[PDB]
Amino acid sequence: MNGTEGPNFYVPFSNKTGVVRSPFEAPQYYLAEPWQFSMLAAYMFLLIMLGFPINFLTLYVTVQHKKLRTPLNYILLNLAVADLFMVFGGFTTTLYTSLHGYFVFGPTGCNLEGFFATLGGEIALWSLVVLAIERYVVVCKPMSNFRFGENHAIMGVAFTWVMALACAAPPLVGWSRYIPEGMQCSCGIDYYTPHEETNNESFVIYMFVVHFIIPLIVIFFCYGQLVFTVKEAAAQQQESATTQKAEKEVTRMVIIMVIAFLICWLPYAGVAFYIFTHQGSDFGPIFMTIPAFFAKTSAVYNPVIYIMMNKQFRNCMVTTLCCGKNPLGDDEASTTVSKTETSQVAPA
């Protein structure tokens, strides 16, 4: 056999030399140099040290500034929360695991690592549809007088979690399972074994369809609509109203946010689909480690896009960080937002 299937796992290493051991019982240093595990460990350490502050800081700003309540502000507040979950929820285990070379917490550690990474990713993917829709509603404006309220945003948010819980919780209760991958320091869905006892093959299809191909079709199709109407071609002050101009900024970011999701997940999903369609073939530990641990950056790239592609949000942050206020930058040249300062309501 090309690999060592265990009842709980599937090590991508032949056991001809009988040197293969359960990644829930002993170091996997026989799969790769030990330094490389340190590598992974130093990596998760840095990601945690970047992901915590960047996502908490986002969370804290969105709240503090009572005027940041656009559907986007809700969605990115939702992501920052999911990213904190990814950090303490699973990165903490994936760091611990890397340090020891194996899932010392056994299948639990594997479930924590895998669950939160999946939850993290699906919430992102599903938050992208909500943005794709919202963006469609304000650019191709399906209604004549429709305007999303905080209520609607709270809907989109609750939605992304129902969807995300949908494919990330089942593997905890019998439908498929989380199993170590690559060097065995991370956990993903089971694409490796057919394990009928838990219906692995049906769950992988369901997942690749309902939680990948469909959300992308929607996301890509919607874009084919905001091709004729609002286009990346953005100018200076006003564009058909400074309001229209600023509507163009949010869309650029939402597009960029997609490219960012794709870069971060196609490589993982790709290798995932490959194996699924080549179970038992001869692949090794590094095959899925690289995409797997690269995708963990998904826990931080969103807030950074937000802060670099949103004049408003960026300033509230400076306003927050500079304790008092004095939001240098260049403001939004438009509305602002905060708590005691200029969070003054400015309607009609």
Ligand X SMILES: *C/C=C(C)/C=C/C=C(C)\C=C\C1=C(C)CCCC1(C)C
Ligand Y SMILES: *[C@@H]1O[C@H](CO)[C@@H](O[C@@H]2O[C@H](CO)[C@@H](O[C@@H]3O[C@H](CO)[C@@H](O)[C@H](O[C@@H]4O[C@H](CO)[C@@H](O)[C@H](O)[C@@H]4O)[C@@H]3O)[C@H](O)[C@H]2NC(C)=O)[C@H](O)[C@H]1NC(C)=O
Ligand Z SMILES: *[C@@H]1O[C@H](CO)[C@@H](O[C@@H]2O[C@H](CO)[C@@H](O)[C@H](O)[C@H]2NC(C)=O)[C@H](O)[C@H]1NC(C)=O
Ligand U SMILES: *C(=O)CCCCCCCCCCCCCCC
Ligand V SMILES: *[C@@H]1O[C@H](CO)[C@@H](O[C@@H]2O[C@H](CO)[C@@H](O[C@H]3O[C@H](CO)[C@@H](O)[C@H](O)[C@@H]3O)[C@H](O)[C@H]2NC(C)=O)[C@H](O)[C@H]1NC(C)=O
Q: Which does 269 bind (CB under 5 to 8 A by kind): Hg ion, a copy of itself, ligand Z, none?
A: none
Cα gap 334→314, rounded to integer Å: 13
Q: Is 173 in the site for ligand Z (CB under 6 A)?
A: no
Q: What is the distance of C-alpha 210 from the center of its chain? A: 17
x/- site string to ligand X, residues 189 to 228, per CB under 6 A?
x-----------------xx--xx----------------
Residue 113 assigned as binding residue: no
Report the candidate in 127, 157, 115, 110 with the shortest Cα–Cα distance to residue 8.
Answer: 110
Q: Is 272 in the site for ligand X (CB under 6 A)?
A: yes
Nearer to ligand Y, 102 or 283 (CB): 102
Report the candidate in 42, 64, 35, 11 with the shortest Cα–Cα distance to residue 337.
Answer: 64
Q: Work out how close the CB of 94 gets to ligand Y at its nearest, in angstroms, rounded to a whole number.
A: 22
Q: Which of 266, 277, 290, 346 binds ligand HTG (CB under 6 A)?
A: 266
Region of 130-138, 255-263, 279-287, 304-312 interacting with ligand Z (CB under 6 A): 279-287
In DSSP terms, 4 is beta-bridged to 11
Nearer to ligand Z, 1 or 241 (CB): 1
Cα gap 101→36, rounded to integer Å: 10
269 within 8 A of 204, measured Cβ to Cβ: no
Residue type, 279: Q
Nearer to ligand U, 137 or 304 (CB): 304
Nearer to ligand Y, 20 or 124 (CB): 20
**Secondary structure class of 25 (helix, strand, coil):** coil
**Secondary structure class of 156 (helix, strand, coil):** helix
Report the candidate in 336, 332, 313, 334 with the shortest Cα–Cα distance to residue 57.
Answer: 313
Nearer to ligand X, 164 or 317 (CB): 164
Cα gap 136→139, rounded to integer Å: 5
Which residues, 6+ apart, have CB-to-CB distance to 72 below 8 Å?
A: 131, 134, 250, 253, 254, 310
Q: Work out how close the CB of 148 gets to ligand X at its nearest, in angstroms, rounded to a whole number.
A: 25
As a dihedral over the C-alpha atoms of residue 217, residue 218, residue 221, residue 225, rounded to 10 degrees, the angle is -170
Question: Between residue 300 and residue 319, which ones bind a copy of itself under the rule CB under 8 A?
Answer: 304, 307-309, 314
Q: Is 207 in the site for ligand Y (CB under 6 A)?
A: no
Q: Is 122 in the site for ligand X (CB under 6 A)?
A: yes
Q: Is 159 exposed, middle or buried (0-12, 13-18, 19+ CB in 10 A)?
A: middle
Q: Is 282 in the site for ligand Z (CB under 6 A)?
A: yes
Q: Work out how close the CB of 247 gets to Hg ion at its nearest, in angstroms, rounded to a whole number.
A: 12
Residue 249 assigned as binding residue: no
Q: Is 4 in the site for ligand Y (CB under 6 A)?
A: yes
Report the candidate in 43, 45, 107, 62 with the shortest Cα–Cα distance to residue 310.
Answer: 62
Q: Work out how close the CB of 322 gets to a copy of itself at its nearest, in angstroms, rounded to a whole number.
A: 11
Q: Which of 10, 12, 13, 21 binds ligand Y (CB under 6 A)?
A: 21
**Secondary structure class of 71 (helix, strand, coil):** helix
Q: Is 41 in the site for ligand X (CB under 6 A)?
A: no
Which parts of this chain interact with Zn ion (CB under 5 A)?
A: 7, 122, 163-164, 166-167, 197, 211, 279, 329-330
Which parts of this chain interact with Hg ion (CB under 5 A)?
A: 65, 132, 135-136, 222-223, 226, 263-264, 297, 301, 312, 315-316, 319, 336-338
Known binding residues for Zn(2+): 201, 279
